[PDB]
Amino acid sequence: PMILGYWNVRGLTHPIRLLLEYTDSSYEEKRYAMGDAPDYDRSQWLNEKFKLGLDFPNLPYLIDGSRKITQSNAIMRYLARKHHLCGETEEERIRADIVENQVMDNRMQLIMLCFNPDFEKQKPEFLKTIPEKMKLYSEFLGKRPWFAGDKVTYVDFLAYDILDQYHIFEPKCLDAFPNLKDFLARFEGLKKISAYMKSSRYLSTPIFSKLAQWSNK
Amino acid sequence: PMILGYWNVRGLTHPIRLLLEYTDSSYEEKRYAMGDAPDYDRSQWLNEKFKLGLDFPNLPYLIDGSRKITQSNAIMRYLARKHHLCGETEEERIRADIVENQVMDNRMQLIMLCFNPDFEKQKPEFLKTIPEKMKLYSEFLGKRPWFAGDKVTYVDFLAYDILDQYHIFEPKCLDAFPNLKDFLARFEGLKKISAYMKSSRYLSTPIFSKLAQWSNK
Ligand SMILES: N[C@@H](CCC(=O)N[C@@H](CS[C@@H]1c2ccccc2-c2ccccc2[C@H]1O)C(=O)NCC(=O)O)C(=O)O
Ligand SMILES: N[C@@H](CCC(=O)N[C@@H](CS[C@@H]1c2ccccc2-c2ccccc2[C@H]1O)C(=O)NCC(=O)O)C(=O)O
């Protein structure tokens, strides 16, 4: 079995857990526990961070036999080439690449707001930016069934995850973009995805670590 | 020719600039200017931001004929594919994808301390962390000529820039890692790169905008 290591929170690893499930991968998990406030003890991880053979010790990590990978996109891409879920055309590939990075940016934005102590007074500002973000995803996907075109790629995994977290942080943000609502439902409707979602392993929340101002619980 | 869109700072776009040179690309640039303090006028870029046909408008952007791309790593992948500068084996691709995301992490960490109002007091703690950042690279590179292995790929462009910026920040941070230093001199030795560096095109400074407590002018 493959081993996925991460905190016991959604974090940035959902697309990975969903990809694992989607490709029917055999894997085990290491969900490292984080210490409560104000210490936020991380020795569950730290006791073995330098003891696992990884080039750049980090969470998440994927152990696949001899191969030891870190950096979530890096992990996503490995699984993707493994199950032919990479773009097939140059245009597929440009779309994917942009999407990949676009998701992480939109994700840091969220993070940066949810770990800042000034959350409360930062939120209304942040809120003003969301409709553009969504519009961008909505006009880019357009009428395509999947973000890269006609077939599911690893980028839909990342895409699903960050829009659902945004949807979750702002429930009515997809109201104006029904193609995005339909996308989440199509993704969600995938056989193995539906399935995992009802599983003992599903882990939707908390979205962040106990250090966050939002979805820390 | 092609067009590269970006502020008139080094920021995160050095790799693209060196890739375009190294590939003998026919490109022109649109270096936008940011007003000064306190205003910090962006109107020069904002007024055409949504009028370029980009899906997710950003800086940098690459216009190559019909193709419009955003997100520095996507741009880099794009040129990588165009000129065959990616890993050719699974192991090279993994190394490449891990390195690509690793650089930007280390990128972020540097920038999170230079666009930090408290730069100077947290500076002494970041410099403490630098020797283990550099050590990971050093150990990862090993005896190899290039980060992926046998030939040059786009991640070397990436690796070179962030190692060069850490180096500028901390001039002795490479003294214990001489192979990193040979990486840098060897990267500077590629003919088209050599030439470019001595050209009117080269922009090695400043790294950041105005609002930074490093590469501030
Ligand atoms: N560029 C890396 C991000 C890596 C990362 O920051 N790893 C964090 C976990 S995600 C982490 C996080 C924790 C809880 C909740 C949310 C997040 C998060 C989400 C997205 C992006 C960044 C953060 C992280 O910093 C960490 O714990 N590293 C191991 C260690 O330092 O020893 C990736 O894409 O894999
Ligand atoms: N993840 C995207 C980052 C995109 C980004 O934030 N672009 C910044 C410029 S880099 C930006 C920068 C600005 C000022 C000074 C320096 C830089 C910088 C330097 C290093 C690293 C990153 C940056 C960003 O903060 C921006 O100005 N976008 C246009 C806009 O939002 O409308 C990329 O990889 O392409």
Peptide bond into A15 cis (omega under 30): no
Same domain flag for A98 and A184: yes
Question: Cα(B98)–Cα(B94) distance, rounded to whole angstroms?
Answer: 6
Question: Cα(A173)–Cα(B35) distance, rounded to whole angstroms?
Answer: 33
State whether residue B67 is helix, strand or coil.
Answer: strand
- The partner residues of B28 in beta bridges, in order of sequence, read B3
Same domain flag for B181 and B196: no
Q: Is A101 on the interface with B (CB under 8 A)?
A: yes
Q: What is the DSSP letter of B149?
A: S
Phi, psi (degrees; rounded to nearest 5) at B47: -70, -5
Same domain flag for A80 and A94: no
Q: Rounded to the nearest 10 degrees, how much is the dihedral formed by the CA atoms of B104, B109, B110, B113?
A: 150
State whether residue B56 is helix, strand or coil.
Answer: coil
Q: Nearest Cα to A166, choosing from A105, A116, A118, A84?
A: A105
* Parent domain of A58: 1-85+191-217
Question: Cα(B168)–Cα(B208) distance, rounded to whole angstroms?
Answer: 13
The domain total for chain A is 2
Q: What is the DSSP letter of A35?
A: P
Whether B74 and A56 lie within 8 Å, measured CB to CB: no
Atom of ligand 2 at shortest range from CA of A104: 1
Question: Cα(A18)–Cα(B64) distance, rounded to whole angstroms?
Answer: 35
Phi, psi (degrees; rounded to nearest 5) at A52: -120, 5
Q: Is B72 on the interface with A (CB under 8 A)?
A: yes
Whether A78 and B97 lie within 8 Å, measured CB to CB: yes
Q: Nearest Cα to B23, choosing from B78, B73, B99?
A: B78
- Extract long-range pairs of B171-180: CB within 8 Å, 24+ residues apart: B173/B127, B173/B130, B173/B131, B173/B134, B174/B134, B176/B131, B176/B134, B176/B135, B176/B138, B177/B134, B177/B135, B177/B137, B177/B138, B179/B138, B179/B141, B179/B142, B179/B143, B180/B134, B180/B137, B180/B138, B180/B141
Question: Cα(A162)–Cα(A184) distance, rounded to whole angstroms?
Answer: 10
What does the block give as tokens for B6?
Answer: 């970006």
Q: Please, which experimental method was used?
A: X-ray
Residue with tokens 């969470």, as numbered in its chain? A59
Same domain flag for B199 and B186: no
- Distance between the two ends of chain A, CA-based, in angstroms? 30
Give the helix ranges, DSSP H, for chain A: 14-22, 43-46, 72-82, 90-114, 119-141, 154-169, 178-189, 191-197
Close Cβ partners of B216 (under 8 Å, ≥ 6 residues apart): B206, B208, B210
Same domain flag for B78 and B136: no
CATH of the domain at A4: 3.40.30.10
Q: What is the DSSP letter of B217?
A: -
Same domain flag for B67 and B122: no
Q: Nearest Cα to B147, choosing from B198, B80, B208, B59?
A: B80
Q: Is A98 on the interface with B (CB under 8 A)?
A: yes
For a pocket test of ligand 2, which of B13, B59, B73, B113 has the largest count of ligand atoms closer than 8 A to its C-beta?
B59
What does the block give as tokens for B64?
Answer: 């190559």
Same domain flag for B115 and B176: yes
Question: Cα(A9)–Cα(A22) distance, rounded to whole angstroms?
Answer: 19
Close Cβ partners of B137 (under 8 Å, ≥ 6 residues apart): B159, B163, B177, B180
Q: What is the DSSP letter of B25?
A: -
What is the separation of C-alpha A150 from the centre of its chain, rounded to a whole number of angstroms? 21
Query: Which residue's alpha carbon is nearest to atom 13 within ligand 2?
Result: B209
Q: What is the DSSP letter of A6?
A: E
CATH of the domain at B93: 1.20.1050.10
**Residues B215 and B18 sit within 8 Å (Cβ to Cβ):** no
Same domain flag for A116 and A210: no
Closest CA in chain A for residue B106? A56
Atom of ligand 2 at shortest range from CA of B73: 34
Question: Cα(B59)–Cα(B56) distance, rounded to whole angstroms?
Answer: 10
Same domain flag for B152 and B134: yes
Same domain flag for B70 and B38: yes
Burial of A153 (0-12, 13-18, 19+ CB in 10 A): buried
Question: Cα(B162)–Cα(A153) distance, rounded to whole angstroms?
Answer: 30
Same domain flag for A105 and A180: yes
Same domain flag for A18 and A109: no
Question: Cα(A77)–Cα(A147) distance, rounded to whole angstroms?
Answer: 16
Close Cβ partners of A189 (under 8 Å, ≥ 6 residues apart): none
